[PDB]
Structures are given as structure tokens and as C-alpha cells.
Amino acid sequence: APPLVNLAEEKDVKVTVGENMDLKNADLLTDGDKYYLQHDATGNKEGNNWENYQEQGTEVTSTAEGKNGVWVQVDLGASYPLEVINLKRQVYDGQATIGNGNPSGQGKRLKGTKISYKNTAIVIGNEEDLSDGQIVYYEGNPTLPDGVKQPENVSKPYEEAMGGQWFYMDYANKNGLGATELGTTKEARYIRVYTENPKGAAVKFMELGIYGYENEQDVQSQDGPRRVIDNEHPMMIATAYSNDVYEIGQEEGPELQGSNTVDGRWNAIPDDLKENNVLLLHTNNLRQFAPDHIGQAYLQAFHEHGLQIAYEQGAPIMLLGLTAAATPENGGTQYNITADMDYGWLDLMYRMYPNMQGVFNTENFWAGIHPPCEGSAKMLEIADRFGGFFVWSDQDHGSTVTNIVSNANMKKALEKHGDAFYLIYKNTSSNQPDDLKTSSFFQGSWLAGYTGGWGMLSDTWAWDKQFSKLWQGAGSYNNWQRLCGEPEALLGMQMMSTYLGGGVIYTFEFPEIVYGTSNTNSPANTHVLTELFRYIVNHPAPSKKEIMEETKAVLYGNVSSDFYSGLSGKPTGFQIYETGRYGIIPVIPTWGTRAEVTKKLIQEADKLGVTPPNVLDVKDKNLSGQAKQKYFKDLYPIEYVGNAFADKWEGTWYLYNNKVNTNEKQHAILPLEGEEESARLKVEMEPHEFMIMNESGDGTAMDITLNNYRVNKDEIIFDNKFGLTWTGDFSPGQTTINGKLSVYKYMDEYNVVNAPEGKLSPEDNELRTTTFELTKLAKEPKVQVVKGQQPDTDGQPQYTEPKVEFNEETGKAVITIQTNGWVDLSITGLEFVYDENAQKIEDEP
Ligand SMILES: CC(=O)N[C@H]1[C@@H](O[C@H]2[C@@H](O)[C@@H](CO)O[C@@H](O)[C@@H]2O[C@@H]2O[C@@H](C)[C@@H](O)[C@@H](O)[C@@H]2O)O[C@H](CO)[C@H](O)[C@@H]1O
Ligand SMILES: [Ca+2]
Ligand SMILES: [Ca+2]
Ligand SMILES: [Ca+2]
Ligand SMILES: [Mg+2]
């Protein structure tokens, strides 16, 4: 257990009241329950109806005539450093009803009249009569203990809330309501709460949480950030979705999609990569549409439970803070139990769990604009106060970033806390060609210093919108089938392109396919993600300085989707390029006027010691399409010839075949280093392959890593040879739809890395050819596999031994290999001589 605890709950406390007061059911004050839900075992429903909100609690009643004010006091049994207090009293005058929310007819919200209590005060101390009392909070005019002085600044009443009220130990910080620095404590044994009900002599106290430490040695402090996210410290996020089943008080940790667990996902990660990974707790459709009491209870219980399990395993955590515009801010939806977030609870999670790091937001604007901005503004402030971070994932059709800045509170929060805020793409709607513009916006936002970084969320839902079987269009298959169809190597190609643009966050869905099921690692995870991510961890991406230095043009405004065609590549929806010649092309959205953005970018460049790029409005005559190619070709020299993607960056060539789902070979012809400048490497690749090449520099050697890992889904998924049920319906006794269960069955039984007996190795044994032509050489070069992807349990090879043909009379050496997966090749004994016929590395006339 972490050092910050609810002492009121953990200790054997004594509860008392003043003379002429009656005390009833004292144990309810410190039972950890603020909601008194009764039907947890049946999904918080009795029949088809959500259970009512029924408020129970410790009742204190004045029996002194004409004097309704009461107090209740807790003796913790010893003096402890206290940091936070949470007080909740009866919220509703009478009983609240369950009425219509947002969206109308599905969302549910409590309705009724809320109580605003008066003459509320909180006093703590180390004498039982509190003659040494210190004021934590004071509203109205309750008579304090003898020896405790009236405070100068007095609070006014507030409306009681579902989560209660939160108090901290700095009276000068908003009269005790203002959240303090981690570890701001006062030592006390006795805690007294004063309250007067506006109607009558009785107050029901539903909970008094008193959070502190066992001793002063355990008191925490804010000594720096919880993590660094940058080119030298990249971060992979894996989403841990609730399976939508949970019961408050259950012994076992929350079940995740695909028979996964929080601890299980963490322990599946290779040890050397754990420091660059985080788990995102996502509530998914847990208690979806539920009214306030059920929503808040389940949001809190699910996240706390995940945090605790993570804490025991040493796993850092992000929480889903906001999706589907489901926020407690005015106008919010109830599409998710994030609707019932209590910002006091979110603060508590950072104080209680040292492994709590970040907040995640995605997919809001289809459902509402300003509510998710208002909520994100508050959560960004909280995250950054604790040295944490905030990630916002979305595709930008053109108004995503401008919507964010159009909200005054979010704009202001970004100005103060922007260094802890990260924008990552999300290519779910792959059929809209906004992938490349999104990356440009997000890179541009970072480059100019409005945000702390950028990155990627690649979603296999992208495949659903366009394709099915290999080389085929969507056809008439179920969407859960098409979800499974994406080539594994393509995920690596996407990672490579994000890396080259100085991206620092990497995340993938559908998690049960890309990371795995049943706490195992999937084929994608094992043979692509973990391999390439290890390269990214050990070979830092370009810094902001390096991006700035290589960038000759920055655009301003809402760049056209189709701008990239005939430049870096046609937007495919899959976040890949035809060439690396121009980089990502940073486009700064309208964070301010062109002049304001220009000044900001110049300041950022100056700070890095770099020449500022020129800023052009997207509408500039030079970017028209006739003149755009001329303008960009004059700024950025050609590096290689051919139709494959290639980028040379700091001595290393990065390549891929850039066809998403068309079976075409592509090539790249590279000028090689050394004394002989006519030296050439031609690479030819079939689709779904990426490559990293490093020359020795003296023209004698080179190392090549290639990866073209692709599982064939044609028979198992699309022909459906095992007769799985791919539909959106529930089957008898199931809380998960058939389509999902089928994905899980595929991953558990039919596509298993190192498949044990009775399970199938992945369908990955059909190999494809990569060829390398080296010219002009005097003698045959030497090739060998340093390391290669090993067989699954079926014994079938993932590569064949490389073959070298060398022609004496011409310079040409041809190296051929067949792979499905990764190999590290080493080529040595290269003796280049002058080649008058060497391919010219230049543009066409
Ligand atoms: C009902 C259901 O099973 N949903 C799962 C599914 O949800 C995603 C798909 O519906 C997809 C179709 O193209 O659209 C996505 O927006 C949707 O994502 C989910 O909902 C949005 C609002 C966000 O909260 C996302 O974080 C969330 O994933 O697939 C996801 C995983 O891709 C989950 O399993 C859902 O349970
Ligand atoms: Ca209680
Ligand atoms: Ca380059
Ligand atoms: Ca080198
Ligand atoms: Mg195999």
C-alpha cells in the first residue's frame, strides 16, 4: 500500500458529538462508502432500471432548543501528518429522481433540489478539546473551541456535491479549498466538523475521509517531473480497456478486454522496455449512461483498483479523463462514466499513487466542443501541478486544434502548462484523407512551442474503412473481421515515419490484436512493435533542434488535405509517405495571428541556437500546386532516386515500400559513402517492409535490418475456416458481443506466438524477396545473417540464407533474401571502383 492513506478508514477511530447532540450510526462516517449502492452484484440495476440514489450516513441531531448547529469529531488514536480532507453530507433535500441526460433517451442524470449547508467549519489539533485547534475551513459563524481564534477570511456556503468537498492544509490558499503542493501537511489526532442544516436540527454525514501518513518520514514531496517524454525518453502507451464487467468490492482486479489484466499486461512487456511504457486505464462502456451516483462510484472504483494493482507491480499509469464529451462540466454527455469525474478525486489519485502519471483525452468533438475543453483545462492544470502529463488524441479535419484554442480556459491553460501537453494523431477514420495534415499540425504545434511534443495512435480500425483480405477492398465482411486484417509491418512503417518527424509517443489499437490477449504478446507485438521500439529507445529521434535545423519552410493555417500529393505523398489514411525528402512539413494552426505564430517560432528557434524557418501562409502563391513542386524542390535537395520511401537522417537510411494494399514492387537507389562517389545501392522491396541501413563510412561495409512481418488472415479471418461468429449481437449469457469474442478466440487459439500443443502458430511462413544491387565493385562482397527471426513451434523458417551473384565483367553484385519477419544482415569486403554509368541522383527535367 502507498504511503498516503485514508487514516479515518484504516485506524480504529472514535467518533463523538457535543453535549445536547444525539449520535446515530457512527461507523457510516468512516466506511469508505459515499454512495450506498445496493445492487452492485446485478450491474446496479433492479430489473431493467438503474437503482435509486439512497443517502445513508452518520446522523447528528441537536437537542438544544433554538440551536440547530451540530458537530462531529473523529479521534484517530494518535497524531498523524494530514494532507487532505473529504467531507460529504446528504446532497438532496428529499430523494432525487433519475431523469433524462445527454444524449436524450439514453443518458441518465439525477434530478432534485440540492442542499447548501451553512456554519461549516473544520478544526484539527492534538488536544481532545481542541484548545490547540488549527482552522482548516470556516464558513458562517459557528462557535469555535475556546482558544481557537476567528480567521480573518471567512468562506461562503457551497452547494453539496456527489463527491463531497475537498480541503487542504493551507488556509491562505483559497481559505482551505485550494489544492496544495504534494506533502503539505499538518500533524493532528482530533478532527472536528461543524455544520448547520438550513432545515432542522439534524445533519447526515455520509463520509469524512482524512488522508495522511503513518509518520513524518513517509510524507511525500514534489521533487521534479514524474516522467520525461522527449526524443531521449520516448513513451509507448498501451490501452487497458475494461471488459465492462465490475462489481464494487470484488477481490480480483478488473477484467480487461481479451482476458487481460493490469498486472498481466505489465509483466508481458520485455524488461528492458518497461521504463519506456505506460498503461492507460480506459473505462470503455463500464456502466455506460449511468446516473451520477453509479457513474462516480464506478469511475473511482475501477481506476483506484487498476492503480493499486499497477502500484504493486511498479507500473506507471494514465487514466482516461475524457472521451465522447462525457464530462461533469455543463453540457457534458454521459457516453462514458468520465461524465462523473470529481477533480478532488483526480488530485487525490496523484497524491496517493506515485505511479499515477497522466490523463488521456480522445474522440470528443463529434459530441460536443466546449465542455470537453473546459474539463481538459482543469485536468491539464492538475496533471502539471504533480509533474505529470496530458495526452490528447484526435484526427484533425481542420477544426480540432482551432476548437481547442477557441476555448479561453483551455487556451490559457495551454499557455501556462503546454509543456506537459502532447497531441497524437488517430487514423480511425482512415477514409478521410486527413492523416498527413494532422501530423503536420501536431508537429508544427510542438515546433513553435505551443505544446510539449507529438506522436501517434495507429488504429487497425483504419483497415476496416477501406480493405479486407490482402490486396482487396472492404467488400461485405463484418467490421470485426476487417479489424484483424492490417499488415503487422505497416505498424512499423508508421512508427518509423513518426520517429523521423521527432515524434515521441507511440500507441496502437485494437489492443488485443496489436499487444495481445490472455496476458501474452501478439505476433505484431513480438515481431514488429517491440523490435522497432527497442531501436527507438536506444537511438533517440531527432530533437526539436534537429527538426528545426532541417526545416526550411513552415506553413500557417488550415492546409488542404491534398497538399501532400506530388510532394511527400498521397494521403492514404495510414500515416505514411512516398518520400522523406521534405520531412513531415510542419503546419502551424491558428493558435494566433500569422505574426504572433511567427514571433513564437522565431523565439523557439533562437532558444535552440538555430536559424528560424520561413513561415508561409497556406494560401501563398508559391504553394499553389503548379509552383509548389518548384518551391519545395529548390529548398530540399533530392537524396535518392525511386518510388519507395527513403530518408537519410544522421548517417542512417530509413526505407519502406509505401503501398498500403496494392501488390507492387518499389525501389530506392542510394548514393553511398566512401572515397568512391559513383558507388550505388539499389534496394527493391515488395509491400509491407521497412528497413534501417548504416554504412561503416569507409565504403568497405554496411549493416542492414529489414522487417516485413505479415500474418496471412485470408483463410482464418475472411474465409472464416474455423466458423467463428462475426456479428454485433450478444449470445446467451455473454456480456461481450460475438465479433469481439471472435477476435479474442483468433488471438488465443489460431494466431499464437510459440503456440503450445492444441494451438496454432501464426500463418506467417510464406516468404517474400528483397534484393540489393551494389555497383560498381571489383570483387564479390561477403554477406551474413548476424541475427534473424527464429521459427515458431511449427519449425518453419522466417528467412532463407542470403545468396550472392557477382558479375565479373560489370561491377554488379546482387544479394537476394526471402523473409517474413526481421533479419540483421552484415555486408563486408566492399571494394568500389569508378563507375561512369552510375545512376544520377537528381530530379527529372
Ligand atoms: C461498442 C464497442 O464494442 N466498441 C469498441 C470499439 O470502439 C471503436 C469503434 O466503434 C470505432 C469504429 O470505427 O470507432 C471508435 O471511435 C470506437 O472507439 C471507442 O469509443 C471512442 C468514443 C473512444 O472512447 C475510444 O477510445 C474507444 O476505443 O473498439 C474499441 C477499441 O478500438 C473498444 O474495444 C470499444 O469497446
Ligand atoms: Ca460513508
Ligand atoms: Ca533526409
Ligand atoms: Ca555510418
Ligand atoms: Mg512461422
Author numbering: 49 to 893
List passages from the publication reporting this PDB structure.
As expected from the construct, RgGH98 adopts a modular structure with 3 domains. Structural alignment to homologous GH98 enzymes identified the binding pocket and the general acid catalytic residue as Glu 411, which is present in a cleft in the centre of the Cd. Fragmentation of this species showed that the deoxy-hexose was linked to the hexose at the reducing end, as determined by the characteristic fragments at 431 and 449 Da.
Incubation of RgGH98 crystals with BgAtri produced a complex with clear electron density for the BgAtri in the binding pocket near Glu 411. RgGH98 makes hydrogen bond interactions with each of the 3 sugar residues present in BgAtri (GalNAcα1-3(Fucα1–2)Gal-): Tyr 289, His 330, and Thr 371 with Fuc; Lys513 with Gal; and Gln 305, Asn 332, and Lys 788 with GalNAc, respectively. No large movements in side chain positions were observed upon ligand binding. The difference between BgA and BgB is the presence of terminal GalNAc and Gal at the nonreducing end of A and B antigens, respectively. In concert, these residues are proposed, to provide the observed BgA>BgB specificity.
